Amino acid sequence: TKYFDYAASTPVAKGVLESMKPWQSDSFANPSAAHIEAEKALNAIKQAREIIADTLGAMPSEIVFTCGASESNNLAIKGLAFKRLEEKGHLITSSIEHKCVLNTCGFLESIGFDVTYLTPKASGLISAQQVEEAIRPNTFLITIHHVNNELGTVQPIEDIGNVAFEHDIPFHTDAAQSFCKLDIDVDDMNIDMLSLSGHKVYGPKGIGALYVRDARNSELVPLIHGGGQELGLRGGTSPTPLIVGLGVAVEHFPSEASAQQTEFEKIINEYSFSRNSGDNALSTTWNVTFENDDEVKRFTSERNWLISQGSASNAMSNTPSHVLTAIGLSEAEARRTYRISLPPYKV
Amino acid sequence: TKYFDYAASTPVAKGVLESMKPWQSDSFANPSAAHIEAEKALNAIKQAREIIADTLGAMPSEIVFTCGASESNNLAIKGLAFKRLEEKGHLITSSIEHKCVLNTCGFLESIGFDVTYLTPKASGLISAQQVEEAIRPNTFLITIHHVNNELGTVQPIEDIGNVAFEHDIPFHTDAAQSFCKLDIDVDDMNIDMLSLSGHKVYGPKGIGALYVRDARNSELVPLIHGGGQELGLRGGTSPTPLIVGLGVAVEHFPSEASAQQTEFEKIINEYSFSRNSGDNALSTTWNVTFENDDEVKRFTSERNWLISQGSASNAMSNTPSHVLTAIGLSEAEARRTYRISLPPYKV
Ligand SMILES: *Cc1c(COP(=O)(O)O)cnc(C)c1O
Ligand SMILES: *Cc1c(COP(=O)(O)O)cnc(C)c1O
């Protein structure tokens, strides 16, 4: 009434909710147990894992369940770093990553790791060439997001993956905003690890995944040590309802825009604005800078939309979006800038 | 039909399921957002946090949401350890902890930390005196579980907490099996950190918590770095349905045994057995060693109960429960030993 903040979270699809229901009280075993009720949960988990693997062009065993892209990003990064506590090393990322990536890299710096935060162009774009130029003898990970959560910018992951392949450096991508929206083939894009989030694709909150190439033989240091779940890479009892719901979300991901809401497209033009990353953004995120404070006032008074201006930490520090300032907007411009996002769909 | 494996997981209460429902598709904002829908989620999260705090005699801010006791155990342990990567140090735990604790401590050993795994008595008991005798100049954490998940053994956490207090060593307890069943006051027991799991108390899977004394000023290293959630201690978008459901579970935790099922008590005596930790175990977990293989055969053919014999890793290695062998049972005895567990309730 009206919600235009889909890049922040999405509503659980009816089919997803239904599919979760039998695993609440009807059949509720710990999937680790040795009896038939655990068997049933395990089979349902297998189906979801296969659906996710299929969509990424991966093998089922290469899908590690987590609780979301934040935990996934942490596992990808710390999983490699924590095998290097003595010799340390260098990581390449961007300055416009989600704050979870920025903050995990900040922590790594605090324990002696070196990190380059690549600065975007005004378009929001990170180039493969800049990745290539940042490479050092001790670079051990390149992490670059696929689609930017504030701007919608589609990054050149294939070209970046090519650079990482040419140097035999692991390539991770935060795909929380691209998973299901954009077709992703892990081999075609030379991806080693990929993060995704359930509640960004009409799935439930509290679930996501990390693709890990050759997970069975992976030397990644587990973030959560546990009882053997997820090939020993990710501990904690498998939350069968959340896993099942995630599979259903992926399977029934909307194929057409964004329904009727994404028109929208006939409203927004009654206003004067500049779209940030306008030639490089997905159709479902419109990060827009209105022309002046008077236009902002008109827009917000006429439209009672729930939208977004930047990260929570920026709100707390009373500063503009880190993303907006990285792309070169002034503080005054940032004040007039809003992310209006629409129901995700394929394409 | 019939499920006697409650120590492994429990069925979500009707009130818990209902309470989750409006946060799936009716109101589904990211609680980090700045608008009214996030406000509503945040308020509901606050209520659950307060319910949990109240039950532990803690302050609301001292409750850190996680996805379960595994993630909580990892945060408690690695959160302290990762501030010591250079000087390392010593940790005291038991050899009969849940495998998540054993495996995180094993990892710490692999990066240069020293760990003492205290061996139980035949009763399953760990003593405060043994903790005291294991203390070293560089001991920086004592972690001992409150109630054992295989045996039901109630450990002397107050006495152990007293020892830790007398040395100004942090005391953590894995309370996944004791939370709500046994009255826990964090100040009375001198607890610094405490792990709990939602699906052990008729809550949903994928949620738990870590009590952290003085969380606001805690120097714990976050396991999941994120956008600022949980006072910066635990990243990832707050899963409002799971958090709300956990509060409801705690609030309506059963007050009387375990209903009718826990009779049970009139069945079990038709069989010949010895109860492990029989003088020290909760009424709702019966870890029992039948007299001979013939008695086992009689019991299993007559009763189609879903029960448990030991951890998943022990099943995979084709070895007896680590818990059972630690308490001194032979492999043959372990073969005849089953954990039969009942609906949890207060007292
Ligand atoms: C939402 C998001 C995250 C965090 O994912 P959660 O599942 O909410 O923890 C990370 N990266 C990007 C790009 C996102 O949009
Ligand atoms: C279940 C359990 C755990 C693990 O908790 P999850 O929430 O299932 O990850 C840890 N310790 C004990 C004692 C348990 O019973």
Numbering used by the authors:
A (entry chain A), B (entry chain A): 2 to 348
Authors' own words:
Cysteine desulfurase, a pyridoxal phosphate (PLP)-dependent homodimer, strips sulfur from the l-cysteine substrate to generate l-alanine and a protein-bound persulfide intermediate on the active site cysteine residue. As a versatile sulfur donor, cysteine desulfurase activity is also essential to DNA phosphorothioate (PT) modification, in which the nonbridging oxygen atom in the DNA sugar-phosphate backbone is replaced by sulfur. In contrast to the typical dsDNA PT modification mediated by Dnd systems, Ssp systems confer single-stranded (ss), high-frequency DNA PT modification. SspA exhibits PLP-dependent cysteine desulfurase activity and is predicted to initiate the delivery of sulfur for ssDNA PT formation.
Here, we determined the crystal structure of the C314S mutant of SspA from V. cyclitrophicus FF75 in complex with its natural substrate, cysteine, at the resolution of 1.80 Å. In this structure, SspA forms a symmetric dimer, and its dimeric organization resembles that of other cysteine desulfurases, such as DndA and IscS. The SspA protein can be divided into two regions as follows: a larger N-terminal region (residues 1 to 254) possessing the PLP cofactor-binding site and a smaller C-terminal region (residues 255 to 348) bearing the Cys314 active site. The PLP cofactor is covalently attached to the side chain amino group of Lys201 in a deep surface pocket via the formation of an internal aldimine Schiff base. The imidazole ring of His99 forms π-π stacking with the pyridine ring of PLP to make multiple van der Waals interactions. In addition, the phosphate group of PLP forms hydrogen bonds with the side chains of Ser71, Ser198, and His200. In terms of the cysteine substrate, it is located in a positively charged surface pocket in SspA. The side chain guanidinium group of Arg340 and the side chain amide group of Asn150 make three hydrogen bonds with the carboxyl group of the cysteine substrate. The distance between Cys314 and the PLP cofactor is approximately 14.4 Å, and the distance between Cys314 and the cysteine substrate is 8.9 Å. In addition, although the distance between the catalytic Cys314 and the substrate cysteine is 8.9 Å, which is too far for direct interaction, our structural modeling and biochemical analysis revealed a conformational change in the active site region toward the cysteine substrate to move them close to each other to facilitate the nucleophilic attack.
